[PDB]
Amino acid sequence: LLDLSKFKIYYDNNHGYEWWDTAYLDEKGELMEKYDMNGTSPAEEKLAEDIDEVDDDDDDEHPSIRYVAHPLPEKINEAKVSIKAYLTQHERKRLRRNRRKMAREAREIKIKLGLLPKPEPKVKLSNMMSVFENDQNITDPTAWEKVVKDQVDLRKRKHLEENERRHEDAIKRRKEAVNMNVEKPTVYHCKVFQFKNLQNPKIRFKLKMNSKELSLKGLCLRIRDDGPGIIIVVGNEKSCKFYENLVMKRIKWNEDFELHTNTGDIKMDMHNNSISKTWEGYLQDCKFKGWFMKVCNDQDSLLRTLGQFDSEHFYSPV
């Protein structure tokens, strides 16, 4: 039975009456006939409402010849991206001057009339010898040195501490911030790449992790593991670009690699394998919920999978 099946398949291959490498061309007649019947007018769905009807010199009543429509032009909701108003260098400088000046003034007031702190002389190892406001400068020379060096360290330490604090706070913000930002995406850049093979783990890993990083909606489908397959990537434009770069410049697909298994480590020479950017467009609605990489046993299956997002058209069989 198996043999028979194989034979049949072979027969089909040599000259198929319709084969699913490239979708079927032939027009079914029965359906057409049915459509025609439905129409009933010898013209089409469009003209059907003229319905073999004649008024005066061929005119029609149900659709009026007289009137010209001026229907409501649907205004698209343009997202008000508040413009990054820049500053001239000079303006920036002025700002810096003024705020800083104000701060200084405040300090003066809050160190003169307030007396909230008191400003001590900023010693160093060069001032060390000439500062006498703090006592012990020759009296307790090593002590003095310790004090001054210590002070310096504190200053440096303080700076470093401040930096650390900043780093911390920023980190804290970022996690929260990301969570907060569930903005409504207006338009999605997309890129679909297809490849002859990816029996390399490394490449697959790269595809995964990068996608995860970049919030890149899409997928990576393929036929028979070793067979040819498609990457679809969708997202913000920069991310897409990055992905493309990774695919083309960073990864070497033609490079040789090792497959690790329980039986033995299999060296894979794949000079034949390559990658091409099939598409590089903009999609109206991005139906890809995440980055659902897959393998399929056959082409039909792959197509079906693709059409889970109402988009089989991405795959290009060659």
Partner: protein, 357 residues
């Protein structure tokens, strides 16, 4: 909603309906006949052959033309010559195969030429549009001079993108960066329609070859399908995201195809009531500039050029990249397919017209 009228339009509208209807009926009959006499094998084989031919087109000859790039390239109905409008505003005409110029005409359009269409009635009163904001008929001659203008038609306020000739020959459609697309008379050279139906411009018109339904591809991505007669629409904007820079019917009224800025060519207005795309197509990496078909004269075969430096061909049942045409050095902005055979004539930012054979 907001509905006035005109008498000239009415006079013409009836004619349009008659003409459209009869032709439509004929087309339907032809279609019926075709399926009735078809068989699985031979037709399929023929299709395959055609596809192969399309694939193995190669850049035959590139004749440089203008100072700036070549917006429009339009082959005649007779298909002997091609008319090629540059951004400079000159529509040099070339004997298609040899691809040598006949004349130059810089003084015609001051602005960027939009699109040129030859008259479907053999008698070659080719129309052309521009950013100049007007359409111009040019009665073409082989012997005496190159061209001579007949009628200018100042109706549009803003720059025009595309003109077409309604299959009859009695009407000229002109779609523009202004809100409207306007249908004109061929005889008197005066208006009749103006469909205010887009928030931005109408970048392309295309008349269905029966002469009933016109697609107005807008810069809003609202590709509208206006019945000329009713003044009413059966639209789907749901195709495109970016502007719809081109649109063209498969001559079998069966299909419109709107080519986009998004790059996706959407192909629709089908027998199906839900109006669903049997397929979309991934046309060009960058934008699509022109989409054409060629079932007038021969079989239906999508050919498209884009800002990707690649004209490419799709079978109009499957919708699949049957093969790219590396030929242009730079962007490609227009493209016409020979009515009869396999012979593409396309123009671009290379500032040259190019043949494929």
């Amino acid at each position: 909603f907001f509905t006035p009228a005109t008498s000239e339009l009415i006079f013409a509208r009836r004619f349009l309906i008659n003409y459209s209807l009869e032709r439509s009926r004929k087309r339907l009959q032809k279609e019926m006949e075709r399926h009735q006499k078809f068989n699985t094998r031979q037709e399929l084989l023929s299709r395959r052959t055609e596809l192969q031919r399309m694939a193995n087109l190669e850049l035959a000859g590139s004749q440089l033309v203008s100072t700036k790039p070549i917006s429009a390239v339009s082959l005649s109905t007779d298909d002997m010559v091609v008319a090629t409008g540059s951004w400079a505003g000159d529509l040099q005409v070339l004997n298609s195969q040899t691809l040598q110029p006949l004349t130059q005409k810089l003084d015609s359009h001051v602005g960027k030429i939009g699109a040129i269409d030859w008259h479907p009635d053999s008698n070659n009163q080719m129309i052309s549009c521009a950013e100049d904001g007007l359409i111009k008929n040019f009665q073409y001659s082989n012997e005496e001079g190159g061209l001579r203008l007949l009628g200018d038609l100042v109706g549009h306020e803003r720059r025009i993108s595309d003109v077409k000739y309604h299959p009859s020959g009695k009407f000229i459609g002109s779609a523009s960066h202004d809100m409207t697309w306007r249908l004109w008379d061929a005889s008197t050279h005066q208006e009749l329609l103006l469909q205010e139906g887009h928030d931005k411009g109408v970048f392309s018109l295309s008349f269905q070859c029966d002469g009933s339904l016109v697609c107005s591809g807008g810069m809003d991505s609202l590709s509208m399908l206006w019945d000329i007669r009713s003044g009413s629409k059966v639209m789907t904007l749901a195709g495109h995201s970016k502007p719809i820079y081109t649109v063209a019917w498969s001559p079998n009224g069966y299909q419109v195809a709107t080519g986009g800025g998004d790059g996706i060519i959407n192909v629709w207005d089908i027998r199906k009531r839900d109006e669903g795309q049997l397929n979309q197509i991934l046309a060009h990496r960058n934008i699509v500039t022109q989409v054409r078909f060629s079932k007038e004269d021969g079989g239906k075969k999508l050919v498209s050029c884009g800002y990707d430096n690649l004209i490419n061909v799709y079978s109009s049942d499957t919708w699949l990249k049957m093969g790219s045409l590396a030929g242009h050095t730079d962007k490609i902005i227009s493209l016409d397919i020979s009515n009869n055979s396999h012979f593409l004539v396309s123009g671009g930012w290379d500032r040259s017209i190019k043949l494929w054979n």
